[PDB]
Structure formats: structure tokens, C-alpha cells
Amino acid sequence: GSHMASMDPLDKIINDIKKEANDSGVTLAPLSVPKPKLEELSEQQKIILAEYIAEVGLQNITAITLSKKLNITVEKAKNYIKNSNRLGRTNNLKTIGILQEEVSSMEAKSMTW
């Protein structure tokens, strides 16, 4: 696909006392890290969170609906989806080609006009 990263002094406090907004996919780092892992729920809250992902496979959940499964905020709900994602996919193996195979799956290209 397409992606980009950079480092600047204005990733933290840039605009944090003028305007607020909400988007379905922007940024991937809160503190110089690719989202830190979090598991801070009550016993019943943890079971609601778990039984949802265990039924729908961490791939059909939404911060809107997860906000309403647990009676939380969208900002809590979206935090889980950003840190806890590949843990619920597949990680029980010792060879993956280090995300650098590019054979018999994505045998395609793109161009500029």
C-alpha cells in the first residue's frame, strides 16, 4: 500500500487547547512508540470486552459499538483497537519472512500520472 513516518516537536502539545475533533484513522504514536499495550478494565468490563472479540474475532469491532458494549467513551474504545490488534490475529509461529516476502499474494504495482 502506502504509508509515511516522521519526527517533529509538534506531535504532542501542538493544538491541545484550541480545537477538538474525531477521525476513523489518523496517527499511530502517542509517546514515541507504535501505541503502548493496555489492559485496564474491571472484572465484568474485561469479560464484555473479551466475549465480544472472542465472538467477532477483533476484526468486526468498532469504537462506536465498543463504546456502547461497555458504556464507555469512543476514546477508551478506540484505544483498545489501536494497541490490541495483532495479538488477537496470529502470533504462535517462529517464521514470517519478516514482512518482506512479496511472492504469490501481492504480485502487483502502481504508477504516477
Within 10 A of 56 (CB to CB), how many other CB atoms are there?
A: 12
DSSP state of 44: H
Read off the amino acid at residue 5.
A
Q: Cell triple for residue 95?
A: 517464521
Q: How was this structure determined?
A: NMR
Helices (H), 2-73: 43-56, 63-69
Closest to 34 measured CA to CA, from 73, 78, 77, 84: 84
- Contact indicator for 66, 21 with CB cutoff of 8 Å: no
